[PDB]
Design a protein around this ligand. Structure first.
Ligand SMILES: [Mg+2]
Ligand SMILES: [Mg+2]
Length: 132
RNA sequence: UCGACA
DNA sequence: ATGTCG
């Protein structure tokens, strides 16, 4: 019941909070379609959120109707809400990630999409294909 | 008091 | 260990 014709996204970090990056891959082939340059400080859930929104933008720009898989129940909710409810402190070190989050929320508030955002079922299917 | 997703 | 929701 895996929808193979899909984009899978995941976060990787060093620390949490710590250095965050994320990437999007073709679920079928594992081909890397996008990978964000590491952000010096962020949280796991911020990165999982940014990964989904990046995926939406990526598919929208390419007129693709593929769903997105994420394993993050938090990020899936934040996207649905158009609101990333992070409690990461705001300072000069976290300014960059908070700016990307704000801009992601803004994108969600200014664009439509029909992309299904699906939960990757890790316990049944193993690690998401975008895992680091 | 947890349970769960990461 | 921490970030998050049910
Ligand atoms: Mg994940
Ligand atoms: Mg992972």
């Amino acid at each position: 019941e895996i929808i193979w014709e899909s984009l899978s996204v995941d976060v990787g970090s060093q620390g949490n909070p710590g250095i965050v990056e994320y990437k999007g891959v073709d679920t079928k082939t594992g081909e890397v379609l996008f990978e964000r340059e590491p952000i010096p400080i962020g949280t796991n859930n911020m990165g999982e959120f940014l990964a989904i929104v990046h995926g939406l933008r990526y598919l929208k720009e390419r007129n693709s109707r593929k769903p997105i898989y994420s394993n993050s129940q938090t990020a899936i909710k934040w996207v649905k809400d158009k609101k990333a409810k992070s409690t990461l402190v705001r300072n000069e070190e976290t300014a960059l990630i908070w700016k990307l989050v704000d801009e992601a929320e803004e994108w969600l508030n200014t664009h439509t999409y029909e992309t299904p955002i699906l939960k990757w079922q890790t316990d049944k299917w193993g690690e998401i294909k975008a895992d680091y």
